[PDB]
Amino acid sequence: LQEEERERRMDHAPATSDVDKAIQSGVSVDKRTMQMLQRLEIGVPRRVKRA
Amino acid sequence: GFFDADLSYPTVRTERMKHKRRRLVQGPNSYFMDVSCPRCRQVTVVYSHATTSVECKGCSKKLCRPTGGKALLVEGCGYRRKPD
Amino acid sequence: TIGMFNEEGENVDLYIPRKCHATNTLIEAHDHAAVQISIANVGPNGVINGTTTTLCIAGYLRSQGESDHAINHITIDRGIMRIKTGKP
Amino acid sequence: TMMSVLANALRTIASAERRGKRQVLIRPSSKVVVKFLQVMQKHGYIGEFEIIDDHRAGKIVVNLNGRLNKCGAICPRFDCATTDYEKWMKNILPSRQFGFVVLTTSLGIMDHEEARSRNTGGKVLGFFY
Amino acid sequence: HPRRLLEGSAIMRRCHEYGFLDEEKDKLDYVLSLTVPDILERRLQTIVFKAGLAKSVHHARVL
Amino acid sequence: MTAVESGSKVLRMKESDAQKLLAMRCHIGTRNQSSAMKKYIYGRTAEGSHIIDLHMMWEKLILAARVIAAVENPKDVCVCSSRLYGTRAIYKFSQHVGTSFHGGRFIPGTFTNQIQKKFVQPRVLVVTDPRTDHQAIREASLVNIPVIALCDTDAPLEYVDIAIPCNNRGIKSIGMMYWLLAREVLRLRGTIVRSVPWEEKVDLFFYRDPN
Amino acid sequence: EWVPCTKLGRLVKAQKVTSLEEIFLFSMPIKEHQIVDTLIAEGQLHDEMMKIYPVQKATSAGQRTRFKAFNVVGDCDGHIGIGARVGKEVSLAIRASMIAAKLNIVPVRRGYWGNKIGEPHTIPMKVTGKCGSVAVRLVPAPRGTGIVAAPVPKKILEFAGVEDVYTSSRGKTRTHGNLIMATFYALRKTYGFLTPDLWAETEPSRDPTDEHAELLAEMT
RNA sequence: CACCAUGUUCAA
RNA sequence: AAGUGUGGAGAUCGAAGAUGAUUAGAGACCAUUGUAGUCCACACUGCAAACGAUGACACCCAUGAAUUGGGGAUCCUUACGUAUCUUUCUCAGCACGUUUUCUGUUUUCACGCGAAAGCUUUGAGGUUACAGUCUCAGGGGGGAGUAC
RNA sequence: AUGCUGUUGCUGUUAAAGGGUUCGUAGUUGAACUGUGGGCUGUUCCCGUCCAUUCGGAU
């Protein structure tokens, strides 16, 4: 019952996801990663940086 | 990944690394170059691994120096590699 | 038409066994690492169909570490998994 | 030093086939070792193979299809009369049903089954099954 | 082959002649299936018991 | 496995999908490198970390999903994690997809000791790590269970059939690979549709230190 | 009664898996000896004890003694199984080897020496099997040869359905623990050798636990 | 780091 | 290595031997010595656990740290990544870093093998599915490496 | 019986056994190549022009 209570208190998420708050500042990839993302069939994604 | 090695038609990355006799067909590493003398300026053909010390036939000077591998050309000389 | 016959054309042996799709190795009855993997054939809208592509791998090939290289080589041949990106 | 080039080639095929490879690189090659492989193609134990030209002895890249269990070379090349085929089948072959003993005869390099039909004898080269 | 047509038709002949194989068995693979009681049934001690001329098989060997 | 029989582009990675992978750092490998995962590396970055090819990540991700979606009775998939960072993600993948799940010490004999009362017989094992789940994999070698694994750059790939390359180390990186696989298996089944985004937040897949 | 625990024994008890070669096809471990005597008919399955010998463990204050019993099982139509268990009483280890020999049941490929005319009289190729140093080699024999073997391999080869065979044995055959299990390893290899009959491509099937997954969930 | 050698014959 | 011959040398350690001591005895260990020897020259010997208790020459053979010398770069993909610090003369230098590759001495690691211990591109693997070439030795323990 | 004489067919790290190392004759073994021909006739997707902007669409 303390395990059934704290399993309900833990399964709670904010309205904005931690991934949606991560894109909204920019993902800021590395040199090698950005040099890879030119090669893809989708190109370099939007909301990106090069650091 | 996702491309498998074909032993008949190996990758340029795989094949450039290999020893010259460990290639699929063995071949040279060396080449010829057209060396211009530092004074005197006349062109000479110098082998890349010239263990002898080649002389300028016009200048009378020696524009190469043997090493353990590739021979070292003198300072101030111009050279471009010849094909084949 | 697989397995030995009689000269009267009746299939004499019991149990024609499976063969590895990577190494063509006949899978024995005690080879308890030998697995079948069913991959869902999927349609144009990205939802699975009622048909699956099944590929079976021998037990020694999983034992060494070389099964994952073999599942790649099969699914490129079957056309299941793409070999490279398209051009940008 | 390398003594028998055919015994070298069949040993590298048999070794790479028990390892389950997809291709072998055979070095050096001969006219004998390609005539041995073309016996192994006709009864479908190997796939397509390719002879690379050096101005040396060549190299052969053989595509394996999983069907070969063991190929080997009998050294020295013992002389085999026509009455001696059933003796060589019981010694080096696993069964009378499958498996071939390759011989070099006057008519060519053939397996044991063809040479029995053409009523010829030869020196034994090797086997494949 | 000459040694199988001759001399393979001799061994099938003596099986049919002495009662080792009935006349349906003609393929030569039935000689490989003969047993020791298949031969012992053809002794005169056995037929004189089987034809009915004696009460027991030890009556037949006496007579 | 983003190649369908007709030839559509329905399964392929999109600029929204790959933007999530870059944000959650699930393409950064560790410093070390093994032979079997060497084909999945694109290149090495400065500070010596390995970068994983996002094509081969996505092709092995969808290939593992085309295997999980082709399982009627989804309880025959068992997904398991001995490392602590996985256990919350293992629970939420099991909730949306409907698979068995196990966390913590594996308790040997779960797959082989048949008179135990914790005896299960899955058809597909999904391990979070090939290394910390060595015991789950080694019993799958005994009772004919193929293995799906989230492999890092140095992974022992004996008995692993579909090795997914990712970053299984960090808390956000793990769970993003379970969100995206749960997001995908539900698409292949037809539960959710591919047009609208899957509303369910990734945050519940993340492990959170309850003390 | 017999309540099964494994999914294979649930399907054998429900007659969903009907024959024993449906288990051999998918490389499944048996794990329950009631599977075998259900699938094989009861009168067409013979067993008898190969060897019983005592093995001792030196302890403080004397020796511990347990008897190691060998059993062989199989109808004489291509199924063979050998199991070796141990026990304090000789009656327990004989009973435990019966349980063990059915779990190790395995098929025997049989073939022809010369022409093919009926049921196979012999093994289809030369095969050896090695346990310890004792390796026995089994060679195909002609149609009316018989089993030419030592009386410990000969009793195993009778239960495996092989009617005519040549046999060699290379080293320390008076150790019957390894002589028994080397005849078993050699007959087990008869479905391991890829012959040009089996070169053809066969269409894949579905596991009995794949196909009947909806029925097995109804036992829970 | 003083000295500290040995226990008849078979059998259980 | 010991040993031998003829010359040198002769410091130290030191078979033999001598004294102490320990011990039931001590012909031993321990302490003090001390001859031949140790060391060199020129001859002789040819006796090792002279070992990896593993004959030589080729072939194939999975993986990850290193190390020594030389060389080179900074539906099976048409190619690509470079730092550090010493520098008025055996100095167009030296060392390092990342990566190739040849040769050598190895190490924890896939098959396979072995009675096992273990071996494993450095085979003891590629072997009853037994043939690349040559060579030497063995055939229960002794007597006996003895006698002639 | 004895693959305990081994050509088939034995062993040699530890069970008996690789000889201290090189050179070396008799001996045995020894790399590739000069070629086996030809003619006729039988035998639904995806790639763009209209919508939308960290996730779509008719085509």
Ligand SMILES: *O[C@H]1[C@H](O)[C@@H](N)[C@@H](O[C@H]2[C@H](O[C@@H]3O[C@H](CO)[C@@H](O[C@H]4O[C@@H](CN)[C@@H](O)[C@H](O)[C@H]4N)[C@H]3O)[C@@H](O)[C@H](N)C[C@@H]2N)O[C@@H]1CO
């Ligand atoms: O000849 C070499 C061979 O061509 C190559 N296969 C290589 O194998 C490895 C390589 O292993 C060695 O790692 C050593 C460094 O720790 C390196 O040695 C080298 O060191 C450099 C710096 N001193 C050189 O200057 C030096 O000349 C060179 N000996 C390598 O040899 C690894 O580095 C690779 N990561 C993987 C390769 N497979 O080894 C052969 C000689 O061992």
Ligand SMILES: [Mg+2]
């Ligand atoms: Mg006394």
Ligand SMILES: [Mg+2]
């Ligand atoms: Mg004292």
Ligand SMILES: [Mg+2]
């Ligand atoms: Mg002194």
